[PDB]
Design a protein around this ligand. Structure first.
Ligand SMILES: [Zn+2]
Ligand SMILES: [Zn+2]
Lengths: 148, 83, 93, 85, 99, 109, 99, 82, 108, 94
DNA sequence: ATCGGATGTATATATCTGACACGTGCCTGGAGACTAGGGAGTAATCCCCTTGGCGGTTAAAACGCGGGGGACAGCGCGTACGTGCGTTTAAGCGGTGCTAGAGCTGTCTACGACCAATTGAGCGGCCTCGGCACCGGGATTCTCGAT
DNA sequence: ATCGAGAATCCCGGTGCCGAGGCCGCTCAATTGGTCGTAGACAGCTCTAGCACCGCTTAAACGCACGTACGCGCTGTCCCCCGCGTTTTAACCGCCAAGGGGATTACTCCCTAGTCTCCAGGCACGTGTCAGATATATACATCCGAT
């Protein structure tokens, strides 16, 4: 129906003009379930990090936000062990005019600059605020063994 | 089994009787339409709250107590029907 | 079945106290029941609000007396206050 | 002038406008899309996030939500795709 | 030669008659149908206890009698005896119903 | 008192003190309820009931009847000045209205 | 030769002036003395917070302004522009304040 | 003791309230009627305010008593508490 | 929604869910209070507050001011069809009245 | 020091900085807003309490609040408020 | 000012019928005795804010005058409403049948209260700078007597 | 239909002050984690009354006609509000001073809730009979046209 046309148009845009370092597609037979791949930003301690995540579309779209969840896990204050993401676009200030490219770009940009106001894991955010070098070395240690 | 234009069942003699009970000796000719409009507005206001009360209880019949509660909520208490 | 409580018998006792000969029909008794319930709700709500205002957690007889003074008009309020005070004084001893 | 077909595409459903409504920010979109974004989304403008609660309350109780100046143009100049819609 | 009363005496007679009694002055079936129509406008497939319709009729007749008393006062205020729609409108405004 | 009769009889009332106590306790009015509040409230309720009943019975006797019907309650309430102010916004079913006609509408002498 | 406005054109100017402002229109000390007199009629040797007197003044002025609006409508009903005591009495009676 | 303070509500003070009410012309008997109705209103409010004061076992009438009395009479007032 | 964040932020509100929950529970309303009542009540209160404040700010801007005063609150409330009906027996202190001169009184 | 007194000032200010980021508010206006919030809270809570009492319940759920909002608010303020409350509850639960 | 019809209303008598006042079984709610703990009554202290008084200056109230516009009474026209009669419509009453939904009982499972350790959100107090109030001069705009 | 003088209101620029908005310290109220009793969600069965139909009276509604009395427009008189100038009165502001009573704290005791046992007061159901409604026939108050 309308959501089918919307998702097909989104996929057509994604195929014609893919963004940089993000690649999304339909993982399964149905168009509701998607798989996405994100490369770590160049100016970050996440060098060489490739991350796979799943996209689950609610029945009513785009009037309700999609559910993105990391398959792996990352050491970021806004991501927990299960892979959940704490971003305002995802849940709070979501609007139907937004597209998949915008939310994926925002997720990618989150890695460069963490949000310490409402982190998902307070202890690692406190560690990072205590010292940046420790946070960078710990993130590099995790990402040099689990990202690849 | 819909119902249409039933407000004409509030006939002119009934309005004359109500005015007589109210103490009115002589009545203009355009009073009846104004009274019909006023009565319709009052009925809508009361019945909306009555139906709201009956749906909150997961019922399908508008009992007398819903009407009494709506009337009390609107500032018009009614004695003699319970509560 | 179910049991429904009402103030019918007490109203009849009071009626036979004031007018030993007159009876009372069903609709009038229903009206009296509604009236008693309404006055109970008014006075109880006012007393509860008075208790809340002063940071109390109890309803004593002085909250009820102040609520009676607030609700009822002049002579009615004076007579009701006298009746309640007399009843409490007779009950406590 | 006459608006083009591409310019008359709703940004929510990606189709032609049916019963368009224009917000006080001069943003036009479909009436079903407007009702859905009022009921399930954050009740603002989907594009510039301007709060339109009072405007909606004022105009929908008197059946004045729908744009009429441009609805005639849309229904007149492009009949076939509105018919299949 | 046939006897007929001067215009106004039968009106006063009806005033005295209908202020002495307590019945309901609106026929029950049309009012019941009107109530049912408004209710189906609100919610479909509704049933009405007879007591509900009776209470609604009681309340409506009391309201209309009070409004007509206020209308009569408004009409007499303007040095008249006919109640006119402007009297009803003024009475409703001062009571705050229409504002 | 002797603390051996019923509470209503100990207080000298006809209205129930235990029932009023339960209604105050279960009614969600306050966390605690005193011991003398139900007696006071029952006394006030009984006084008001007796007043209205006396006036209604007087009206019924004046009407040559031995049974108070709602018309007599309406007459008693509306004729009194304190009761009519206490029950100004209340509607009595099958009560009617008091007979009065404005002096302007009466026939010219 | 001295310039005089026709009767009625300075009243409308005052109407426009006082509906555009929000200050209180009664002097504070006489009203405070009146409040204290009534209170000491009720209970002797009382004290007032300043906020209590100010709230009483606010409420009284709002009530009087609303009553004067209703009185003006009552006066206009009888095809007049002058407000009279009977207008106040009718407005109060219809509002239910005196019945 | 105070006496005859109702004459402190002068004629201009009533004309200003009438003007804010939107009154163009005023008769000469309005002022006494306004004074009477204002006195009735003030008595009605102050009686309940003092009752609230006496229940709390205080000797000063606080603004919250006035707010409570006004709310009790259906004249809710915003700006002084509550 | 995920836990480990404030209740006011789980629901996306600004009014306190915990304070409203305590007020409902300690306010002599009912024996028990469900877990979803305070969220609903806080949402309604915040909606009403924002609705009034938007119109008040518009009225303040129409006067070339930058600060809401009670006059602007009165102007916002009395010019709205539903807000005037909701707050109909309420008096706003130092709010004045709306300008309204009857057409009969105007010069002819 | 003085005893602590609670209010709704900071939340009203946070709401104000969303609709109008470049507008302040006076102290008297804030007092009026606090009074308004308290009044509406009391109204809705009392109506919900009576509504739950009529049906011989013991709990004030979101259903009682929803029906109280339906009863109390005018024509479409009620619709929009019910929509907002349902949205908030749904967002909170999941 | 009367007086006659003429009409409507109030009064006295028989009768009969269904609702009111009372009686009986029983069961559910109220009374009696006891224990534990916190709510409120009482005494004391502090310091805020309420009341009282003086002096000045000046904005508002009180008083008077001239006059014009509005309130009020009297007249005449004509139209709309009241009263009465004959006719058409559908309300009211009874009797019957059907089933949808209100009301009650039994299981049981999940939601809400209660309690204890802990910490950050929100409150009280301080401080400062910008928004709004005020003053002074000029431009703009209704108002009215005179054409 | 208009031109112009006198007067009130709005615009604009500069100065100043106080209160609104942000920051800091801290205490206590909300959060989290765990356990337990019971409220209400659900399934099933009973049986009450709400709905639908049919036929017969006959009462209330409707339509039409005549006429009269009340609504409305107009004119005229007069007197009482209004606008403006002058004088008198006391409201308002700033200041200082004393003390009453509001608000907080600590301690104690006694009053109310909660539990268990027991029994009788009040509720539901059933029955007789008399208060009130109705029908019928006079008595009288009241209204309207005619003297
Ligand atoms: Zn669309
Ligand atoms: Zn926009």
């Amino acid at each position: 129906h309308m959501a089918l046309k919307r998702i097909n148009k989104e996929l057509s845009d994604l195929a014609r003009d893919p963004p940089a370092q993000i690649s999304a597609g339909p993982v399964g037979d149905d168009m509701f379930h998607w798989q996405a791949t994100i490369m770590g930003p160049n100016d970050s301690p996440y060098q060489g990090g490739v991350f796979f995540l799943t996209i689950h579309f609610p029945t009513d779209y785009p009037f309700k936000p999609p559910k993105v969840a990391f398959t792996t896990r990352i050491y970021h204050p806004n991501i927990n062990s299960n892979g959940s993401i704490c971003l305002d676009i995802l849940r709070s200030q979501w609007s139907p005019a937004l597209t998949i490219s915008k939310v994926l770009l925002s997720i990618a940009s989150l890695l460069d600059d963490p949000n310490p106001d409402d982190p998902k894991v307070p202890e690692i955010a406190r560690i990072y605020k205590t010292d940046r070098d420790k946070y960078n070395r710990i993130s590099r240690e995790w990402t040099q063994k689990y990202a690849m | 089994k819909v119902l249409r234009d039933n407000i004409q069942g509030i006939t002119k003699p009934a309005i004359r009787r109500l005015a007589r009970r109210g103490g009115v000796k002589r009545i203009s000719g355009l009073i009846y339409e104004e009274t019909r409009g006023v009565l319709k507005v009052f009925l809508e206001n009361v019945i909306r709250d009555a139906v709201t009360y009956t749906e909150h209880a997961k019922r399908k019949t508008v009992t007398a107590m819903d009407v009494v509660y709506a009337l009390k909520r609107q500032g018009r208490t009614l004695y003699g029907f319970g509560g | 079945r179910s049991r429904k409580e009402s103030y019918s018998i007490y109203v009849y006792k009071v009626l036979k106290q004031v007018h030993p000969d007159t009876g009372i029909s069903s609709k009038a008794m229903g009206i009296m029941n509604s009236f008693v319930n309404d006055i109970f709700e008014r006075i109880a709500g006012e007393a509860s609000r008075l208790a809340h205002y002063n940071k109390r957690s109890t309803i004593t007889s002085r909250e009820i007396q102040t609520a009676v003074r607030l609700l009822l008009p002049g002579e009615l309020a004076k007579h009701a206050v006298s009746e309640g005070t007399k009843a409490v004084t007779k009950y406590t001893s | 002038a006459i608006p083009s077909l591409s310019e008359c595409q709703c940004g929510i459903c990606m189709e032609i406008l049916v019963e368009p409504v224009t917000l006080p920010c001069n943003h036009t979109l479909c009436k079903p899309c407007f009702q859905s974004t009022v009921e399930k989304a954050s009740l603002c403008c989907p594009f510039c996030r301007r709060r339109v609660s009072s405007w909606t309350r004022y105009h929908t109780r008197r059946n004045s939500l729908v744009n009429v100046e441009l609805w005639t143009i849309i229904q007149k100049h492009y009949p076939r795709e509105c018919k299949l819609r | 030669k046939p006897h007929r009363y001067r215009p106004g005496t039968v009106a006063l007679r009806e005033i005295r008659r209908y202020q002495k009694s307590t019945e309901l002055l609106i026929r029950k079936l049309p009012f019941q149908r009107l109530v049912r129509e408004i209710a189906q406008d609100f919610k479909t497939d509704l049933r009405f206890q007879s007591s509900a319709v009776m209470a609604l009729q009681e309340a409506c007749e009391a309201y209309l009698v009070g409004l007509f008393e206020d209308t009569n006062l408004c009409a007499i205020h303007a040095k008249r005896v006919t109640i006119m729609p402007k009297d009803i409108q003024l009475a409703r405004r001062i009571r705050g119903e229409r504002a | 008192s002797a603390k051996a009769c019923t509470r209503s009889s100990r207080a000298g009332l006809q209205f129930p003190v235990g029932r009023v106590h339960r209604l105050l306790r279960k009614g969600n009015y306050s966390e605690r309820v005193g011991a003398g509040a139900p007696v006071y409230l029952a006394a006030v309720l009984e006084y008001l009931t007796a007043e209205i009943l006396e006036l209604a019975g007087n009206a019924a006797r004046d009407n040559k009847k031995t049974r108070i019907i709602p018309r007599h309650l309406q007459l008693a309430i509306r004729n009194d000045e304190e009761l009519n102010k206490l029950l100004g916004r209340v509607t009595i079913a099958q009560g009617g209205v008091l007979p009065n006609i404005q002096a302007v509408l009466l026939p010219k002498k």
